[PDB]
Structure 1
């Protein structure tokens, strides 16, 4: 009884984790966004110097 109560609590925790992770997976990645932000920042600095 005690182990199955703990098991259902851990199952609820896993379902909360999956519920947040599915919403996060509707958004694009993190590191690729950092790479394209670095590229856009370099291009914006070059365009600002040209302007």
Structure 2
């Protein structure tokens, strides 16, 4: 009884984790966004110097 109460609590925690992770996976990645932000920042600095 005690182990099955703890098991259902851990199952609820896993379902909360999956519920947040599914919403995160509707958004694009993190590191690829950092790479394209670095590229856009370099291009914006070059365009600002040209302007």
**TM-score normalized by structure 1?**
1.00
Q: CA deviation at 1:30?
A: 0.0
Measured in 2, the distance between the counterparts of 1:33 and 1:17 equals 23
Q: Where does structure 1 lack aligned partners over 5 or more consecutive residues?
A: none
Structure 1 segments (4+ residues) deviating >6 Å: none
Q: Deviations over 1:1-51 (max 9, x none)?
A: 000000000000000000000000000000000000000000000000000
RMSD: 0.0
